[PDB]
Every structure is written in structure tokens, then in C-alpha cells.
Design a protein around this ligand. Sequence first.
Ligand SMILES: Nc1ncnc2c1ncn2[C@@H]1O[C@H](COP(=O)(O)O)[C@@H](OP(=O)(O)O)[C@H]1O
Ligand SMILES: [Mg+2]
Ligand SMILES: [Mg+2]
Length: 358
Amino acid sequence: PSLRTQPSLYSGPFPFYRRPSELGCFSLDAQRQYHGDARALRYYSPPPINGPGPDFDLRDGYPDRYQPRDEEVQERLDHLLRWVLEHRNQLEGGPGWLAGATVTWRGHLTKLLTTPYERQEGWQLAASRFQGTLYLSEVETPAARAQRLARPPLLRELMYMGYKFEQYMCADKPGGSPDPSGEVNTNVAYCSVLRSRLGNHPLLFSGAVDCLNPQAPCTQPPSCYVELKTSKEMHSPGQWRSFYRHKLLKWWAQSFLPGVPHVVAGFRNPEGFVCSLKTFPTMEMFENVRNDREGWNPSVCMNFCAAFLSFAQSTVVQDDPRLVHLFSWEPGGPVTVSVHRDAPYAFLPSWYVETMTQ
Ligand SMILES: Nc1ncnc2c1ncn2[C@@H]1O[C@H](COP(=O)(O)O)[C@@H](OP(=O)(O)O)[C@H]1O
Ligand SMILES: [Mg+2]
Ligand SMILES: [Mg+2]
């Protein structure tokens, strides 16, 4: 019982992917407390044209104005499940749509999308079927956990700089001035809840959103959202080519699924300053590698994701929230399955299961 991941197996036409619609949202505050509203959403506020160029110190405030989320707490699907519980009757699709859907985090689907091209980091996905619905929840691999606990200082500062970039580009109110004098607190998050469909697989997923563009042409979410990214400055065509082949694939897969149309990138120099910005429309990212022998192909990404969802659906036969089918993958191998029950892999909490049962 295994699933192959080589790109040439998935090189056919681009599958059907239904335009995502936003069903709702939720926020996590500076204490990581859930709120069923948009209080955490920030507003895109880039450097005023006809003014000084970007000149952002991404090291400013590290580490004495840094409040990092405690990554030892494994929340799994818990926050999305709370949202689903509070909106289960109000769900679209009519009677039984949820029973035919797959529920997960946007980032879990992103990892599936990139799997045919991924050569460094493996993953594990726990799957449980409950009342027809297939739930997918990532499990930290042993290697990932050891790498997290032993994170070098350079990597921890690099991670801070990406969060700090958002503080220079976003404001708490529309049209407001960004305020970098405050704290970077990575417990704070605004999450969009979206519905889509990949082939014949209905999807319900949530993803954290960086900011909202109030000046965006369309007011209908998710089309007004903006993704913010940093990357090292590049100086040669070879460096840009490596960026197109490896980094843009990850950016595309993250923003394509929720229908975020623009990624705004700040390019940081060796001293940690962002002195240039570039906008990458999600739907044009593949153009950079369309004629590249070493490029990626969104059809392969999407066809593999569809194949995995079919593979997962047919593998997970039992409707049991205590039962976990664990899907494991390492680069160059197939996705393999093992079966487990209860702790530690079981991830649907009793408060969700009991409420849905009653
Ligand atoms: N496992 C990880 N490895 C490297 N960077 C990570 C990371 N987890 C979080 N980050 C940080 O989270 C920030 C915000 O993510 P996102 O861009 O997806 O909104 C990232 O900024 P960058 O994306 O600019 O690197 C990065 O700094
Ligand atoms: Mg983000
Ligand atoms: Mg971002």
C-alpha cells in the first residue's frame, strides 16, 4: 500500500481546481487565544510612491522585542475544528457536503503540492475519517523535531526577519502607517477559512493570511489578500534561476490554493536591510520556469495532490476518530502507510467528536 511521487507520473493536463471561496475567518491573539472575528487582520501599506524607497532594518528589535510562539505546543487542527464546530450548521453545499470533504491546514496541502519536486525534507500526515469527513493533520518527523530543538542562531534570526518584514509593510488600520517600534509576536495570526475542490475532492482548509489590501480592485475575499515574503538579494541570472526553480515553487503552492493573487517580496542584503521590493502575481509564477529543463510544473503538483487525496480516501476505510492512518514520505521514495490508534497519533479531540456525535 504505497503511492509513487515521481513527477513524470503526473505530467498530464492541469486538473480541475474550483475557485476558492472564503467561508469565514478567525484570529489568534497575542496570548494565542482564539477569537471568531478578524481582529488580527492587518492592512497592506507599502512605501508611498513618490517618496523614499524601502529601507527596512529587519534586525531591529531582535531579540528584545520578539515574543515567539511556543512551538512545543502542538495545536494540530484544534483551532480549525473550533471554527467548524461554530459554523457546522451554517456550512454551504447543503446537507452532507462536509461528509464528503477533506479538512486540513493550507500548509499541509502546500507540502503535498511540492512533494514531486521536494528533495530535502520529508513529511508525515495523520489521517482520520469521522462522520465521512477525512481529516489530515501533519506530524512532526523525528528529524524535523531534532532540527527544531537545535535551531542555529542564524536560522532563528532569519525566521525573525521574515516576521519583521511584515511589520514594515502592514498597518493595524487601513491606510495606516506601519509601526516597527513595537513587538514581533508570532502568536498573533489571522486565518481565512476557505472552501475549494480539487478534481472530485471537496476541500475545507484554513490558512494564515499576512494582510489585506484595502485598495485592491476586488473587495471579495480571498482576492484582496496579499502574501509577504523575503528573499536574499540576487545579482546574477544564475541566482535568479535558482530562485525561480526552488523558492518560487513554494511561494506558488502556498498562494495558489487559497487564491491569493499577489506575493510581495522584499529582497534583503547581507547586513539585513530590505532596500527593494518586487510583486510576483501567483498566476504568472510558472512563466519563469515554463521553458526550463530543471523547472517545476503546476500540473504535476496538482495531479499528484489529487492522486494523494484519492489514495488517502481509499486507504482510510474505517470511520473512527481514534484510528490514524499515518502517511510517511521521504525524498526519492513512495508515500507509505502505517496504522495506529489512540495516543500519540490520534488528533481529533473529544470536545469536537462528542459535540459532532450529539
Ligand atoms: N520552518 C521555518 N523555516 C524557515 N522559516 C520559517 C519557518 N517557519 C516560519 N518561518 C518564518 O515565517 C515567516 C512568515 O511566513 P509566510 O511568508 O509564509 O507568511 C517566514 O518569513 P518568509 O516567508 O519571508 O521567509 C519565516 O521567517
Ligand atoms: Mg504568513
Ligand atoms: Mg508571508
